[PDB]
């Protein structure tokens, strides 16, 4: 099967550098062009650069020219995006994709990797219960973390029905917050335990919070 697998993303200081990698399986990268496409929070898709590894010809979006360098190592079947002089505008999920031709389109895409450009320090979340009180609702508030993302599960993955984990929101403090909620039988509140399992990889924070009726 054809697969593109990206790596190299994360949190960087403004003015800093980061190199993204796109490793291809199931085809040779010199057979096509390889593109990088990004999506900033709440915005549309933006093309950033392409390369034809057969001859090393390239092109860049005007906003990235000089500062970014696209390259390829055919002996590793991998393409790269060297990003320098990073600005907040560059914060985005970065995708790589192959362009196939017969007349064509981008048929195989990488999974995406999140690049956050900021001077703010990593910070793990505080996790507070949203206590219940027939259907009853309960949840956890995951507050004051940086950067994204956080993952939330319930009862270590045993509870998935009726779960709603909301998108993160940037607060005026520059830190993220989100809530996850679930609806359950009202009759279960006293005897069944409900635990919010929160993971924040960037700060190596793992928290399990029991949510009880108050």
């Amino acid at each position: 099967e054809v697969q593109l697998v990206e790596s190299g993303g994360g949190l960087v200081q403004p003015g800093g550098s980061l190199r993204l990698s796109c490793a291809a399986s199931g085809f040779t990268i010199s057979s096509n062009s390889i593109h990088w496409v990004r999506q900033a929070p709440g915005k549309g898709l933006e093309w950033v650069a392409w390369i034809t590894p057969s001859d090393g010809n390239t092109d860049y979006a005007d906003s990235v020219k000089g500062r970014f360098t696209i390259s390829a190592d055919t002996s590793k079947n991998t393409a790269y995006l060297q990003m320098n002089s990073l600005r907040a505008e560059d914060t985005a999920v970065y995708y790589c994709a192959r362009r196939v031709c017969y007349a064509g389109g981008m048929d195989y895409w990488g999974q995406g990797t999140l690049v956050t450009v900021s001077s703010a320090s990593t910070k793990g979340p505080s996790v507070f219960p949203l206590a219940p009180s027939g259907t009853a609702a309960l949840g956890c508030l995951v507050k004051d973390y940086f950067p994204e993302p956080v993952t939330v599960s319930w009862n270590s993955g045993a509870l998935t029905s009726g779960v709603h984990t909301f998108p993160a929101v940037l607060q005026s403090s520059g830190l993220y917050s989100l809530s996850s909620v679930v609806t359950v039988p009202s009759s279960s509140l006293g005897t069944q335990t409900y635990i919010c399992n929160v993971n924040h990889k960037p700060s190596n924070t793992k928290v399990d919070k029991k949510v009880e009726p108050k």
Binding site: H35, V37, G44, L45, E46, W47, W50, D59, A61, D62, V93, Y95, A97, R99, Y102, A103, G104, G105, M106, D107, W109, G110, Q111, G112, S126, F128, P129, L130, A131, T135, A137, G139, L141, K143, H164, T165, F166, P167, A168, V169, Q171, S177, L178, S179, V181, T183, K214
Partner: protein, 213 residues
Amino acid sequence: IQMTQSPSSLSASVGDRVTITCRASQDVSTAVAWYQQKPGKAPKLLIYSASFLYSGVPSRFSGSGSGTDFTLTISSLQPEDFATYYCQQSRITPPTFGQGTKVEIKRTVAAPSVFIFPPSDEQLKSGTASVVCLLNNFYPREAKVQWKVDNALQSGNSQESVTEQDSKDSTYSLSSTLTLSKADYEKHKVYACEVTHQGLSSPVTKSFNRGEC
């Protein structure tokens, strides 16, 4: 070259035909492709070279056009078709994406179930108080959620978040979070969220009185 998509957004019922248009500032021959993107996920190729269905894509998707005027058509819209759809021209470098068109699934009206949550004792010790209101499983997305503290309407101290449309029943859920200092929180008794929605005959209010009153 500029790719202008129309409409910017649309809603249509399950089974209906949806048409999205992409117009180019110059002749791009037939070098135009269409992509579906679900929130947080890699785009997926639907149509290439203006009219060709990419292998594995459902037969309900089709594409037409040449020169300066291109269209993507979904002949029978399904609940899983909610996404942002993008055109891209690749006749000349640089390739250019359209702005995107958000497709929403229209369905019957459904009133939200409303829940309110006081701040935890743990949070109160930190010096801050968050009050959360949940509106669960409703349609349409449009909802007015108002905070009242001791029956006084609140101004610039809440933030809302909405889930993506449910893939099976096409509903939304919404959270509104009111954030106050602990000092301000402890000056008032009644915390209430009032919800106005097309599915509700009159506005629904859920409240609690601080100090388990």
